[PDB]
């Protein structure tokens, strides 16, 4: 009966996870090769990207770990005894034609 | 790993100009510079954290 | 007791009952094995 005048502080904690924003036209995982990565606007043309993150201020130098999700694929060929040939390809952020 | 200064609020990053075919999405998390070693180096002498 | 099986004899493992991403809970639709 002697309760003070109080205000509500709301927050959330979401540990262990990565804030996924899928590059899909409805934010749904209908496949890994999404419909916007197959879109001819984003397939045959070049586009700049400027992302802007507003974060809580911390009294410590922090980092920002962004996963630019790609297709980091390796195809491995062994044609003869002792021979180990690999072809690497990741798209979009290509290191390039890393055939061995 | 884009560096965020101390008590900094806005973090502008910029991927310059590129074809975005087969792009899947983003996933991001703030880290700490104390808790993240500068990998690629064989030894980080400024990494006093275990 | 046994995973689902097609019969083409040969005896072929059937892919039914496997887990998927669904916008609606999968127990009210199907049986998940």
């Amino acid at each position: 009966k002697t309760a003070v005048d109080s205000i509500t502080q709301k927050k959330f904690l979401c540990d262990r996870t990565l804030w996924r924003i899928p590059f899909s036209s409805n934010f749904m995982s209908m496949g890994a090769l999404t419909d916007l990565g197959q879109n001819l606007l984003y397939a045959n043309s070049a586009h700049a990207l400027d992302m802007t993150f507003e974060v809580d201020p911390m009294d410590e130098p922090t980092l920002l770990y962004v996963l630019f999700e790609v297709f980091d694929v390796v195809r491995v060929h062994r044609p003869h005894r002792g021979v180990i040939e690999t072809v690497y390809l990741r798209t979009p952020f290509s290191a390039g034609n890393a055939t061995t | 790993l884009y560096p965020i200064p101390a008590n900094a609020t806005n973090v502008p990053i910029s991927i310059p100009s590129r074809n975005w075919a087969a792009f899947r999405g983003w996933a991001f998390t703030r880290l700490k510079t104390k808790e993240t070693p500068s990998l690629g180096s064989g030894y980080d002498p400024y990494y006093t954290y275990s | 007791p046994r995973p689902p099986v097609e019969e083409p004899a040969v005896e072929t493992v059937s892919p039914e009952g496997r887990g998927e991403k669904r916008p609606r809970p999968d127990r009210e639709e199907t049986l998940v094995t």
Partner: peptide, 29 residues
């Protein structure tokens, strides 16, 4: 057709499925 390499459940080989030969496991899709 490599059906003598399969364990016989009964009198027939317990062959796998065609669609299980690959993989599509990937983080987030």
């Amino acid at each position: 057709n490599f059906a003598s390499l399969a364990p016989r459940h009964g009198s027939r080989p317990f062959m796998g499925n065609w669609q299980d030969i690959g993989t599509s496991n990937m983080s987030g899709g």
